[PDB]
Design a protein around this ligand. Structure first.
Ligand SMILES: O=c1c(O)c(-c2ccc(O)cc2O)oc2cc(O)cc(O)c12
Ligand SMILES: [Zn+2]
Length: 227
């Protein structure tokens, strides 16, 4: 793990890096949010933002420092403070923001900035290619209602890595986390939908825990099975 100011960066794969932003909550401690940075040739693709615009700006600084390549687009998993905190930062940097059509609608409701582009999914939950242009190895998939009704997942094509966001937890998770705007009925199905979408993905990266194995998916499903 390499520390860059207030954020931590860890290389998972040669072209796939993980970022961890920490938010100090008075009386609770430092909360951590993970994200993914993928290098597709001569362009950079970012998955999810940090807690704040400042922290997200640091990520862009790191990308320019190490990779030294421009970010093509940035896609978030859902309209939440732990994932869409640096939307304005990307807009200021001139980066195309991609988000679920529902997320863009929920953004002004959760008190966040909506993305410039909206993603639409089919009946099976797969993203419409028309709304996902020049995504490269970013295969977006909508598992359904889980942590939220707008939560989505992203798979890194060409590799065995998949981003579960905040929908999926680790194999040693004792809690599902925030279940406020979550669905306790379809959660058990959505967790499995993600696993069925990316069965060749062994590296399951989440936003609140280190990259686990496929056991994390089944664990989340089993925990949601009792919801
Ligand atoms: O995923 C969240 C989370 O784990 C948490 C979280 C924080 C503290 C805690 O004890 C448990 C949590 O799930 O923070 C969030 C705050 C948000 O506004 C939206 C979120 O999706 C989260
Ligand atoms: Zn959330």
């Amino acid at each position: 793990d390499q520390r860059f100011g207030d954020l931590v960066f860890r290389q998972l794969a040669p072209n796939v890096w993980q970022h961890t932003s920490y938010l100090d909550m008075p009386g609770f401690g430092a909360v951590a949010s993970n994200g993914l940075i993928v290098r597709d040739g001569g362009r950079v693709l970012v998955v999810d933002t940090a807690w704040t615009d400042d922290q997200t700006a640091q990520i862009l600084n790191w990308i320019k420092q190490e990779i030294n390549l421009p970010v093509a687009l940035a896609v978030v998993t859902h309209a939440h403070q732990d994932k869409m905190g640096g939307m304005d930062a990307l807009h200021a940097a001139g980066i195309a923001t991609y988000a679920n059509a529902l997320s863009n609608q929920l953004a002004p409701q959760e008190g966040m900035v909506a993305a410039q582009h909206s993603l639409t999914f089919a009946a099976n939950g797969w993203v419409e290619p028309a709304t996902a242009p020049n995504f490269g190895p970013l295969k977006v998939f909508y598992p359904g209602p889980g942590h939220t009704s707008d939560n989505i997942t992203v798979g890194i094509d060409g590799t065995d890595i998949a981003f579960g966001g905040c929908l999926i937890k680790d194999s040693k998770a004792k809690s599902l986390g925030n279940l406020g705007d979550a669905d306790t009925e379809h959660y058990a199905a959505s967790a499995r939908a993600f696993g069925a979408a990316f069965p060749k993905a062994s590296m399951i990266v989440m936003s609140h825990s280190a990259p686990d194995s496929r056991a994390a998916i089944t664990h989340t499903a089993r925990m949601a099975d009792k919801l």
